C-alpha cells in the first residue's frame, strides 16, 4: 500500500548552536577595534524570506548568539590592545599637587598635576616629566602617589589611531544553518512567535559598551517593551526597550592637549599635559519632558506585570563599582562615568533639562580581567557626543516590606544583557534536509 520515500532538501530545522561569522560594510579609513581581524565584507542584497504558516518558539535568555558576541567582543578588544605600547615604566612614585589653573568648585581635587621620572630612548638616561591625572586613576602610596593598577595589574596604552566608535556588525550563519527572525512587534523574547522570517545576517548591531542605559540600540515598533527572564525574580535584570528614544547630549568642556613623551626606543606615552582656558566638569544633558514621558510609559508597562494600583519608584543604584553605580560609557575616545541620580529619582502613584555630572577615567579594566588594564590616551580638543537612549537595564528591589510599592534601580555591568536587547528576536536553527515519508510509489 505505502512505501518509504526519501526526500532531500526538506524544509525542517532543529535548535542548535554554531559559530557565526560577522559581515560588515567596513567602509572608510586609509583602525577598528572589531572589523579588522575577525569579520568580513557585507552583503549588497540583504535577503529576508517571510516563513508563512510558521510559528516558532524563541528564547532570548538561552540564545547562544549572545554568548558568541560576548566572547568575540572580549577577544577583539584583547587583539586590538595587543599591538600597542606597554606602559610598565609608568608604575613609579608620582609627586602630585592640585592644579593651579582656574578650576570650578565641582572640579576641585578631580585633577592632579603629577611630576615623575621616566625612561628615555637611551636606557642610561632619565627624564623629569609631568602629566595631568584624574583623581580616580591615582592612589596615595601611603596615608607621593601611584597609578591605581600598579598593585594588581600591568597597564597597556590604547593605540591612539584605533578608534572606539562602534560600527554595525551583522551576525551571519554558515551553510546548513539559518537565522530565524521574530517579526512580532509585541514579542517579549520568550515563547511562540507566529510571524517568523529567515535572514542571512542579523541587522546592523553596534557593539555599544555601556551601563544602565542602552545607547544607539534598536527601538520598539509599537510600545515600550518590558522583558525579563523572570519578572517575579528580583535577581534577574529587567530590559526596557523604548518606542521613542531620549536624546542625550554629553560633553567634556575642557580644551585638552596631548603631550607626547618618548618612553622607549620607538614607544610613546600620550599624557594630558595642560588645559587651555577654564576647567569645568564633564556632564550629560537629557530633556526633562522627554525623560518624563518615557518614564511614564515605562511605569505604564511595568504596572502590567506588577499590578495596576501599585506605586512605581525610581531610585538610584544601591551600590557597586563605578561602572555599575553610574552610567558608564565611552564616546569621543574618553571614558565617561555619569551620575544618573537625577534620571532615576521619582515616585509614580497610580492615577529645561536634567544635567548628570560625569567623571572621566583613563585607567579602565573593561572586562575585569586579572593582571590587565588599559590606559586611554587623552583626546585633543573638546569632545561632545549625541546619542539615543533607547532602553534601560533595571533591577527591582527585593524583600519589600510594603506591598503597595515597587522600587526599580539602574543595573548593568554584565554586557551580555546589552546585546541581549539587540539579539532577542534572532534564533539560530539547523537545517535537517533529509526526510522520510510514505508514498504509493515503489522502487522497481
Amino acid at each position, epitope marked *: 500500500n505505502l512505501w518509504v520515500t526519501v526526500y532531500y532538501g526538506v524544509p525542517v530545522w532543529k535548535d542548535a548552536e554554531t559559530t557565526l561569522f560577522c559581515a560588515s560594510d567596513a567602509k572608510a579609513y586609509e583602525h577598528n577595534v572589531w572589523a579588522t581581524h575577525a569579520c568580513v565584507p557585507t552583503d549588497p542584497n540583504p535577503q529576508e524570506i517571510h516563513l508563512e504558516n510558521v510559528t516558532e518558539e524563541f528564547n532570548m535568555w538561552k540564545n547562544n548568539m549572545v554568548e558568541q558576541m560576548h566572547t568575540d567582543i572580549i577577544s577583539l578588544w584583547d587583539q586590538s590592545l595587543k599591538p600597542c605600547v606597554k606602559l610598565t615604566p609608568l608604575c613609579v612614585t608620582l609627586q602630585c599637587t592640585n592644579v593651579t589653573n582656574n578650576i570650578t568648585d565641582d572640579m576641585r581635587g578631580e585633577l592632579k598635576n603629577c611630576s615623575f621620572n621616566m625612561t628615555t630612548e637611551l636606557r642610561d638616561k632619565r627624564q623629569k616629566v609631568h602629566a595631568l591625572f584624574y583623581k580616580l586613576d591615582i592612589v596615595p602610596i601611603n596615608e607621593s602617589y601611584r597609578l591605581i593598577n600598579c598593585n*594588581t595589574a600591568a597597564i597597556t596604552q590604547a593605540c591612539p589611531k584605533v578608534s572606539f566608535e562602534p560600527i554595525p556588525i551583522h551576525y551571519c550563519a554558515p551553510a546548513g544553518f539559518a537565522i530565524l527572525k521574530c517579526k512580532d512587534k509585541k514579542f517579549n523574547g520568550t515563547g511562540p512567535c507566529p510571524s517568523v522570517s529567515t535572514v542571512q545576517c542579523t541587522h546592523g548591531i553596534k557593539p555599544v559598551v555601556s551601563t544602565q542605559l542602552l545607547l544607539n540600540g534598536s527601538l520598539a515598533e509599537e510600545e515600550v517593551m518590558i522583558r525579563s527572564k*523572570d519578572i517575579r525574580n528580583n535577581a534577574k535584570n529587567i530590559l526596557v526597550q523604548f518606542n521613542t528614544p531620549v536624546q542625550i547630549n554629553c560633553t567634556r568642556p575642557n580644551n585638552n592637549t596631548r603631550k607626547s613623551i618618548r618612553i622607549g626606543p620607538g614607544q610613546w606615552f600620550y599624557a594630558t599635559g595642560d588645559i587651555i582656558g577654564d576647567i569645568r566638569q564633564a556632564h550629560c544633558n537629557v530633556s526633562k519632558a522627554t525623560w518624563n514621558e518615557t518614564l511614564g510609559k515605562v511605569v505604564k508597562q511595568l504596572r502590567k506585570h506588577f499590578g495596576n494600583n501599585t506605586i512605581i519608584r525610581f531610585a538610584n543604584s*544601591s*551600590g*557597586g563599582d563605578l561602572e555599575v553605580t553610574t552610567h558608564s560609557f565611552n564616546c569621543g575616545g574618553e571614558f565617561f562615568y555619569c551620575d544618573t541620580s537625577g534620571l532615576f529619582n521619582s515616585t509614580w502613584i497610580s492615577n529645561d533639562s536634567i544635567t548628570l555630572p560625569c567623571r572621566i577615567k583613563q585607567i579602565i579594566n573593561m572586562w575585569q580581567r586579572i593582571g590587565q588594564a588599559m590606559y586611554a590616551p587623552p583626546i585633543q580638543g573638546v569632545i561632545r557626543c549625541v546619542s539615543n537612549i533607547t532602553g534601560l537595564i533595571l533591577t527591582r*528591589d527585593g*524583600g519589600s516590606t510594603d506591598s503597595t510599592t515597587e522600587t526599580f534601580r539602574p543595573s548593568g*555591568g554584565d554586557m551580555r544583557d546589552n546585546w541581549r536587547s539587540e539579539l532577542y528576536k534572532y534564533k539560530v536553527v539547523k537545517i535537517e534536509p533529509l526526510g522520510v515519508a510514505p508514498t504509493r510509489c515503489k522502487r522497481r
Partner: antibody, heavy 123, light 102 residues
C-alpha cells in the same frame, strides 16, 4: 569541592557596626551571586540581600536599606557584609548562601550555605 | 512580594510513615520553589530545587512535586537521620517552617 568559609562569631553593642565576610572557594566567584540570610535565635530564615560578585551590584531588603552594605574582593574570593546602627533584634546567625550557576538558572536555589556567624548585640 | 503559607506548622509522626508538607504561594511562580532542611545548630541544606529535581547526595526518599500555586514535599520514610526543620522558599521569601518530630 566547593567550600564556603565564614568569619567567626562576634559580640557588638547598640549603635556599633559589624562586618561579616565569606570566603568562597572551589568555583568561579564571579559566576554565582552571594546572598546574605540572617536567622534570629529560634526563628525562621530572613533574607537580607544579595551581591553580584561580577561588578558589585547589590540588592537589599527594604528594612535594611541605609544600614546594610554588601561588598566584595574578587582577588581573594570573599564577600563582605557590613551592618551599621545595630539594635538588639539584630542578634542572629548570619549566613552567606551561594546559589547555583546564575547564568542559566535562578539566583535563589542555594546549594552551599556555608557555616553561620553568630552576631550578638548586647549592652 | 510573593506571600507563602507552609503547613502543617508542627508535625509529629512515627518512623516509617510518609510526611507531606504543603507550600501555597500567593500567585503563579512556575516551578521556582526550593525545599531546604535545617538541623538544629547547622545551616540549611537544599534537598529539592525547582520543585521536582533532587540535589545530588540526597537520599531518594525525599521528593517534591508541584506547580503554579501549590507545592508538596514528600518524605516517604521518617528515618532517624531526618529530624530537622523543613523550609520552602520562593525567591527572597522563606516559609515559616515545619518541624517533624518522633
Amino acid at each position: 569541592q566547593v567550600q564556603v568559609v565564614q568569619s567567626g562569631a562576634e559580640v557588638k553593642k547598640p549603635g556599633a557596626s559589624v562586618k561579616v565576610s565569606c570566603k568562597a572557594s572551589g568555583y568561579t566567584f564571579t559566576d554565582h551571586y552571594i546572598h546574605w540570610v540572617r536567622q534570629a535565635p529560634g526563628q525562621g530564615l530572613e533574607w537580607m540581600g544579595w551581591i553580584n560578585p561580577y561588578r558589585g551590584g547589590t540588592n537589599y531588603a527594604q528594612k535594611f536599606q541605609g544600614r546594610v552594605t554588601m561588598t566584595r574582593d574578587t582577588s581573594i574570593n570573599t564577600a563582605y557584609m557590613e551592618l551599621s546602627r545595630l539594635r538588639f533584634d539584630d542578634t542572629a546567625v548570619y549566613y552567606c548562601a551561594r546559589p547555583k550557576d546564575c547564568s542559566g538558572g535562578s539566583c535563589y536555589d542555594f546549594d552551599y550555605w556555608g557555616q553561620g556567624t553568630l552576631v550578638t548585640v548586647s549592652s | 512580594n510573593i506571600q507563602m503559607t507552609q503547613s502543617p506548622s508542627s508535625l509529629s509522626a512515627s518512623v516509617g510513615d510518609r510526611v507531606t508538607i504543603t507550600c501555597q504561594a500567593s500567585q503563579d511562580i512556575s516551578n521556582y520553589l526550593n525545599w531546604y532542611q535545617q538541623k538544629p545548630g547547622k545551616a540549611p541544606k537544599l534537598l529539592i530545587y525547582d520543585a521536582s529535581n533532587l540535589e545530588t547526595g540526597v537520599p531518594s526518599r525525599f521528593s517534591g512535586s508541584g506547580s503554579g500555586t501549590h507545592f508538596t514535599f514528600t518524605i516517604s520514610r521518617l528515618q532517624p537521620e531526618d529530624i530537622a526543620t523543613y523550609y520552602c522558599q520562593v525567591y527572597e521569601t522563606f516559609g515559616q517552617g515545619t518541624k517533624v518530630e518522633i
